[PDB]
Amino acid sequence: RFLKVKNWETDVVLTDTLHLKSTLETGCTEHICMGSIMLPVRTKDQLFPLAKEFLDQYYSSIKRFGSKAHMDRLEEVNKEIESTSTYQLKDTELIYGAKHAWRNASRCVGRIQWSKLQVFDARDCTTAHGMFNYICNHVKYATNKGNLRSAITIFPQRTDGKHDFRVWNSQLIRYAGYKQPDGSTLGDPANVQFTEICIQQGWKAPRGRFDVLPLLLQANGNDPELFQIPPELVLEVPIRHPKFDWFKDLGLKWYGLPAVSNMLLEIGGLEFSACPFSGWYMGTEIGVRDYCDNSRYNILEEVAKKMDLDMRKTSSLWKDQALVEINIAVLYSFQSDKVTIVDHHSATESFIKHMENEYRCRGGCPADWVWIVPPMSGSITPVFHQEMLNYRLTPSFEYQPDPWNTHVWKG
């Protein structure tokens, strides 16, 4: 069976066959679409089919499907599974795995870059201190003095689910959030729960509006441990505006390296619960969501005041006006400091080209429209007009519960 997607700006029609290789489920049924829903101990039994499918893929890509090297590998993995109930990926298979998980990430607009990914194999790691060292190197390498390079660091896979490696942080670099007695929040409201955990685990908080959180690292199912990232490794950008000199006085900055650290990487049925990965920011992530979401820094009011907009009626579009200036300032600041960033126009355009390329060479490209369309100026970006099909391929990055909700405390 074949499926068509149309772009309603250009009338380009594309044919998807890739969706046929999808097995995982979307959350949708024929009677209900759950397209906007945020989020809708494995045994020998199910493991070998998962392994075989991955190896078939891997060997196909390297033009060796059905080869002796292919068949011996299947043999070796099967034997290893039945005798140990799991198996180890070769380095080559791991790199292929991590790249393809990115390539398959239907909510990622930056996938044109998927084949350029620095993979750091941290499977020999055994302790939280070992984790800290690996993570420090990741940050230094990925940051590259502002000329960012995509990377992922992969810690040992899950075994019995009792010895998980986890990074308790949602990102390697993120700002603290502190609930005040008066109900207001100082710093980043999205990180209040985690900040409280850190403080309980012994962190001495500076209690400012932009305090870089410590790392909270769990090796081998043990209680997690605190570590401070060397400040010289944490690249930050002060936010100013090219025309508005008062903008610097708002006191805003952000970090340059977004590094998602709470997701689970699945490859050939293996689960990598600690796999921090980093690329670089699209401007609107910071300028629109982080700064202007009502539940985040929420600076719209303060910015609008200083611009002296008519704030008494929403139909003045004072919010829309402030938002643009804020996003101009983010992009300006990063570019002036030579820190890699991409605007939403450039990024979405690149994605369209990527997506078209993928249809031709791969037979499709799973894409989550709800997430791909930028959170400002949607319809003036080409992705708005692009029909997309969303489905799940493996390897993949998956959500997992925050570890403090599952972790068995040792003491």
Add this chain to the structure above:
Amino acid sequence: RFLKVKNWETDVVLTDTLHLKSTLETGCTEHICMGSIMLPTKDQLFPLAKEFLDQYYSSIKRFGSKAHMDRLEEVNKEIESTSTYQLKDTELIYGAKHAWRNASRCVGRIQWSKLQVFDARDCTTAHGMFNYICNHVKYATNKGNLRSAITIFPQRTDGKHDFRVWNSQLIRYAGYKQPDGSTLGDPANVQFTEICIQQGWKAPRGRFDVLPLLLQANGNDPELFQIPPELVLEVPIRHPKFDWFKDLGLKWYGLPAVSNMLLEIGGLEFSACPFSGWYMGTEIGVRDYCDNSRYNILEEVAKKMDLDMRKTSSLWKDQALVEINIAVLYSFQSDKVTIVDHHSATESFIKHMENEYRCRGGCPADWVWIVPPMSGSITPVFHQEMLNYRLTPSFEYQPDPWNTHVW
């Protein structure tokens, strides 16, 4: 499977039970989501009628009444002999209001129960159709104080006697293909504008020529009619800050009146059912004015603003987009024509969702369509999980007549 939806800005959680009365299909499966795809007999007829009558009598609190059973029996007999049936006026009004209520892509449904229904089922000719449509337009426009309305023409019979309005909206601007390959006026309406000319229309060939009506009665060849200009309310677009903005020569019409859809009630199909409410500002300022395949005015406006159009990262497109949308809202408000900005409309829709969950057990909603085409995440609907499903009575898409009509 009594599903929950969460708002991630407010942490409000609603439980949906209404979805378990979904009649039709979404196009999605367990294996693929198609949420961003734009367009995914007597035996058939009686269960459809029964289902509708069941809702109807439940809503007036006479479920399982003599009146209810009588009406079921009565309709049942009518189908057996006539192969169809006719709705009582009350059922027609309920059906239309509920089609709107059920339109998962409509952000303005908080108004759903205040719909003026015009029964045009006695209409027999295109001239009669014209008359009904002029009355609709005058009533709905209401000197700028717009009132939602629908006019319903006779239902399909054998599919060979359909009533259709060939226009996509009662009021829209023409589209002409120029010698230099470009397009004058509205590119979305080029094909339709051709067909009008192909039929006899004398096009003044301007940037904003109101199209003639092309009306089809009882399956006949459609006929042209010109809406009395005095009935077409238009707004000159100016900016409250930029004097040069009025020089751009932009205008739009006050009355959006969708005319190419099909209203389905109790299995009965109304192929001609033009309906009208009023505009959200972004429909005009963002989509109609700034889509690349529409009026596409961004570059011209940014130019007049003297923005740095060298790099995309100056966000000149975004800056211009805002000002354009400020002007649209400003102009309509200044001329006392009803319009709603995207902040007010989305906030009202959140309140409506609240109401529907509380009083009805849910509200089908299509996030992809509900979230406005600018400033998405600063509107509350962006952070609102929505469940999409098809309830009936409903408005459905139907083919353009010209692809189907025998002459």
